[PDB]
Amino acid sequence: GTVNWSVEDIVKGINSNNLESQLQATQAARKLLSREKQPPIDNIIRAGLIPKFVSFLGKTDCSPIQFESAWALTNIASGTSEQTKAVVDGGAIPAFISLLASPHAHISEQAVWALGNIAGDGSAFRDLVIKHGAIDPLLALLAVPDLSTLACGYLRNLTWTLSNLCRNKNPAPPLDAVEQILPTLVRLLHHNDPEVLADSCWAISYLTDGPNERIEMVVKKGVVPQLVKLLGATELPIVTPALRAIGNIVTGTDEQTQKVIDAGALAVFPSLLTNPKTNIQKEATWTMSNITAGRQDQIQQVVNHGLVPFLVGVLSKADFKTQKEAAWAITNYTSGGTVEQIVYLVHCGIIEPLMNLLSAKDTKIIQVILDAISNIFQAAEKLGETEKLSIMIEECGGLDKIEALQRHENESVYKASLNLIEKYFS
């Protein structure tokens, strides 16, 4: 009936003066836009049908055409920034916002999905959706005693759309919008659906990606523990975003960082630092480096959990990118750690795997490592031990790589290395 229509036909119908003809034609257009086989978004946009659809949104008297056009507009808005721009230019934002209140759950759900695609385009449309005031209508849809009573899919679209209202930066979402949304977001980070949980974490990970004041309004809601918990989840789709949020939170003040330490975070890393998925590792190691860059009592917490051996492990064999984060973790640690602690690090075998990395073709890491070395040597000369440290690095061929680097092209490199040699070698 309404399958495979030509854009030509779809136009004929939408332009006719028969509501039904139009509805039939709109359902037809919807189907075209709902195929994976590269759907005719541009042709439909070219036919000049968006303003027509946008108009059908208001046909309160004919719910089906509202739905059909809503779905059509949704897939067009799911395209390129330009395709999404087309929808916005058509006057759809306020229209879709009106449909949030639609008595037809399936129509408002489409309005939620559409505003989701629009806001997802970026800051500008995100803030435009916000200026038309979509947050209240949205948040209103989740104003129930028990979330479980809502339709599983209906709840996932809302969580996802809110997720995009938090997404992006430069500029970051409006502060009062974040504060308005956070309460509801927290209630979602406690729902049983693994999908709501994942998008919720993405939402929180976004919000925590920025200035410390931002991380604070999130940490201030006491979600950290709930995150550390989700950090132990089985479903990678949840663990990935949860680890990202925790990772961000520790890029803030030592007080905020302490929160995850108290939350129990550190206890989940032996697993995270040996995780089969490299990115979980890459991000877990990065997270570790931001913790080893904090207080000494916080460096102690890392030590007490027996994570130093894990870092040694990552520093030894892992993806290069993971090893670079390890390099930092180790370099940050030796940066603010006590002598006693920098001693432990070497007693764990950090020296050998550290030298071997002085072979990679990445001037920056070669820096970070040498950097860590002088740090270590420094704590050594406080124990006169230096010579042992020398012997040691010489034992595993580190001296060769250093005295070699001494003749590197980067100015800083050959300089730090050259000094190491004279001041501590051969």
Partner: peptide, 16 residues
């Protein structure tokens, strides 16, 4: 002390 970019996050938009 230092944060970076992403392993693409973002399915910004969803179809049908």
């Amino acid at each position: 002390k230092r944060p970076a970019a992403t392993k693409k996050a973002g399915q910004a938009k969803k179809k049908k």
